[PDB]
Every structure is written in structure tokens, then in C-alpha cells.
């Protein structure tokens, strides 16, 4: 039914010294030992409704641009676009 995933440590939220910060909270400060994560059903990582053809179609689309050897470059930031 339920599968348990253990974490040997515990992180504590600490205010900025705004940006969120998390803290180790080592064992000298009497922190909690084992943090449990419960999974009550299989295949929770994958969405339930999915067409199998889509992944293979996109694999073909990506791969044959090597075959046709494109001149495409990566995205550019907009701070460069503004000065133009």
C-alpha cells in the first residue's frame, strides 16, 4: 500500500539575514532524527493520461535536425534585445 522514504536529517526555516533560507539543524541542537515521506499509490511521478506516440514523435523531430544540420543558436536575453 504505502511506501516510506526516509530522510536522515531535518531542515529548519530561518528568516533572511527577503529571500527564504533553510538550516541544517545538526544533532547537537536536539533536532528530529528521521523525516518520513509517504507514497500511497504507484506511478505518482508520471501523469496518468498520456499518448505514447508523442515522445517518439518528438525524438524523431529532434534527431532529424542533426540529419538536416540546422544553423540554430540558443536563446538570447532581452537586455541585449533592448539596446538594439
Amino acid at each position: 500500500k504505502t511506501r516510506w522514504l526516509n530522510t536522515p536529517n531535518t531542515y529548519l526555516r530561518v528568516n533572511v539575514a527577503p529571500k527564504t533560507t533553510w538550516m541544517k539543524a545538526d544533532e547537537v541542537e536536539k533536532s528530529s532524527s528521521g523525516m518520513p515521506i509517504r507514497i500511497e499509490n504507484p506511478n505518482q511521478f508520471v501523469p496518468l493520461y498520456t499518448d505514447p506516440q508523442e515522445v517518439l514523435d518528438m525524438r524523431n523531430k529532434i534527431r532529424e535536425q542533426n540529419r538536416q544540420d540546422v544553423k540554430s543558436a540558443g536563446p538570447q536575453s532581452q537586455l541585449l534585445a533592448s539596446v538594439i
Partner: protein, 374 residues
């Protein structure tokens, strides 16, 4: 207002690869080494570099002590690893880290502190909007394009076998072996000692790694190959040092990678990679085994020696029952295959709902990585 393509960053031990999502091949490939000077600087007016990072550090190997931030797939120096990540983001890809999502890879059986520290140092320092951690072998099988197979990824640092049947991965059948390229480099140094050549410094360890990459192969029959090497001197090759000195290897060409199949040379008592794959297959259920015998996938740089596929097919056929067909799938560009799969997983429209958001991180802490990703 189109969504910007994510960044795919593959980090095994000993090499870092990075590129944009939706592209065929990564933009940047560079070794994951960091060096620091050891000698005294006497010329005034020189540049003040505390640490040489990445490929640049391999240019001036003579005056640095090279170190690796990852040992056996475990990041043992986080502040050092931050330098590789910063150099990747700002100098090679030169992209703003706050503007794109980042996808990362790791080994199967790792301490949870590795994943938690990766998530914490990615959100807190580089200030990414979203991130995800994906297992490498699943990405490689994505790159192969089949929805069912067993994949054995052997890279510098680690070797691991996972099976997948119809999109389901059995967790108890995952096997992990700490026999990798760095151990083979050390064994190559040890056996090159008795020929008459001595290498001690890490700068010479890089040279030994280059010799291993350039001149090695795997023999189909080990005893016959040793007898042939003893009878005649035809199996001999020459190499030139950066100093400039012709050395001749001879017998040691096919003995360095043979330690992959017989780990007793190193003193380790573990089984070979062929028996590791066989034991992973036999741990699975019966009705899938035939399919797992027909879809063996090799991945990683360590599987790039010539003759690995034929030797592994012969050995598995010697172990498997005779009535089944054993096929070994080895793409020519398999060394990059893991990264390629990541790009596909970064380009699916279905995947876009499963990025770990910054907002949910703010209330779930760095422990959301165990709940969200596999």
C-alpha cells in the same frame, strides 16, 4: 511570450556536459577538475588566480594540483562544485541562471544529503525559477527510444544497471557497482609501472588517462590473446609524452579494460559487469525476462572501448539459456546519450507541469525533492 528552453546539465564524475533544451547536442563539454597552484609566484604584475576551473585548468597542468569535486558519484566538496556550476552558467553558456529552468542528473543509490544539498544550492545561490533531478539511466533509455529495456550505464565514477518494463522500473532489481574509469586508470598506472615507466603526479595521471583512451581494446578471448602477445610482438603501439618520448605498451593494451569483466585484478571481490547485468535480469519477474534479454542498452564513456559489445554478447549468451536471442544495442554516439535523453525530457509539453516550483519549495523545504521526483 514563449517559454524559454530549459538548461540540461549532466554531471557525472570527471566530465560536465551542458546545453539547451530541444537541441541535438550539448553546447559545452569540459572535464570536472579544479586546480590550485603549489609553487611560489616571483614575477610581480602577474594575474591573481586562486583556482583554475575546468578545461582551462587542464592547460596549465604543470603548476597545479588537480582535484576532483566528485568521488564515486558523491559530491565531496560543495564549495568547489559551486565553481564548476558558476563557470558553466556564466562562461560557456553565458546565460542568466534566474531566467531558465535547470535539469540535473545523479546516480541511483546516493545519500539523501546529496539531493537535498543540490536542490538547496540551486535555489538559494543561483536563484533558479524551477529545477528537476532525473536519474541518468532512464534518460539514456529515453535517448534509445524504446519503452522497455535494461540499461547499464558505466561512467567515470560509477556503474549501474536498471531494468524498465513498459514504463515501469523495478526498484529492487537496480544494481550498483563501484568499478569505473578512474579505478581502471589507477590499475593502468600500476601495470605500466612494471614495464619501466613511472607516473606519480596527478598531471601524469591525466596523461595515463589519455593513453588509456587512445590505445585500449577488449579481447574476445583473453587467454588466446595473451598467448598471441607472448608468441609475437605484433600487438605493440607507440605513444609520445608531452615531454616527447616514445613509449611502447604492448601487452597492457587489453589488460586494463579486462579488469571490468574480472574485478579480482583490483582486489575487489565483486562480480563482473556481465554477471551484474545477468543478476539484475534474473532478479526481475519471469514474464518480462525475454524482453529484457532483447533490449540491452549500453551507455557512458567507459563503454566506448572497441569490442565491448561483442564480448558482452558472447558472455551473456554463455550465461543465458540457449533458446533466446541476445542483442546488444550500442549507438555510436552513446557517450552523450544520457544528456540527449534529458533534452527530450526537457522538451515534452507533458513534463512542464512537474518542475519543482520555487513557491512550493518555500514551504516544503529542500525535502520536496524526495516527494516530487523519483
Amino acid at each position: 511570450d514563449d517559454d524559454i528552453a530549459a538548461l540540461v546539465v549532466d554531471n557525472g564524475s570527471g566530465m560536465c556536459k551542458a546545453g539547451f533544451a530541444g537541441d541535438d547536442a550539448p553546447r559545452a563539454v569540459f572535464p570536472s577538475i579544479v586546480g590550485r597552484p603549489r609553487h611560489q609566484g616571483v614575477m610581480v604584475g602577474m594575474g591573481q588566480k586562486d583556482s583554475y576551473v575546468g578545461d582551462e585548468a587542464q592547460s596549465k597542468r604543470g603548476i597545479l594540483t588537480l582535484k576532483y569535486p566528485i568521488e564515486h558519484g558523491i559530491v565531496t566538496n560543495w564549495d568547489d562544485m559551486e565553481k564548476i556550476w558558476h563557470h558553466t552558467f556564466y562562461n560557456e553558456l553565458r546565460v542568466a541562471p534566474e531566467e531558465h529552468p535547470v535539469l540535473l542528473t545523479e546516480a541511483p543509490l546516493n545519500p539523501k544529503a546529496n539531493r537535498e544539498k543540490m536542490t538547496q544550492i540551486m535555489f538559494e545561490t543561483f536563484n533558479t525559477p524551477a529545477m528537476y533531478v532525473a536519474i541518468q539511466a532512464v534518460l539514456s533509455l529515453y535517448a534509445s527510444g524504446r519503452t522497455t529495456g535494461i540499461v547499464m550505464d558505466s561512467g567515470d565514477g560509477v556503474t549501474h544497471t536498471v531494468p524498465i518494463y513498459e514504463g515501469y522500473a523495478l526498484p529492487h532489481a537496480i544494481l550498483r557497482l563501484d568499478l569505473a574509469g578512474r579505478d581502471l586508470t589507477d590499475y593502468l598506472m600500476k601495470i605500466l609501472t612494471e614495464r619501466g615507466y613511472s607516473f606519480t603526479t596527478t598531471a601524469e595521471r591525466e596523461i595515463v588517462r589519455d593513453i588509456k583512451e587512445k590505445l585500449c581494446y577488449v579481447a574476445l578471448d583473453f587467454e588466446q590473446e595473451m598467448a598471441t602477445a607472448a608468441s609475437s610482438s605484433s600487438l605493440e603501439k607507440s605513444y609520445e609524452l608531452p615531454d616527447g618520448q616514445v613509449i611502447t605498451i604492448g601487452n597492457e593494451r587489453f589488460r586494463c579494460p579486462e579488469a571490468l569483466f574480472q574485478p579480482s585484478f583490483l582486489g575487489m571481490e565483486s562480480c563482473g559487469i556481465h554477471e551484474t547485468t545477468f543478476n539484475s535480469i534474473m532478479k526481475c519477474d519471469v514474464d518480462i525476462r525475454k524482453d529484457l534479454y532483447a533490449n540491452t542498452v549500453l551507455s557512458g564513456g567507459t563503454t566506448m572501448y572497441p569490442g565491448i559489445a561483442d564480448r558482452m554478447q558472447k558472455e551473456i549468451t554463455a550465461l543465458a539459456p540457449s533458446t533466446m536471442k541476445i542483442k546488444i544495442i550500442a549507438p555510436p554516439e552513446r557517450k552523450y546519450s544520457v544528456w540527449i535523453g534529458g533534452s527530450i525530457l526537457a522538451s515534452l509539453s507533458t513534463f512542464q507541469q512537474m518542475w519543482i516550483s520555487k513557491q512550493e519549495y518555500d514551504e516544503s523545504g529542500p525535502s520536496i525533492v524526495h516527494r516530487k521526483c523519483f
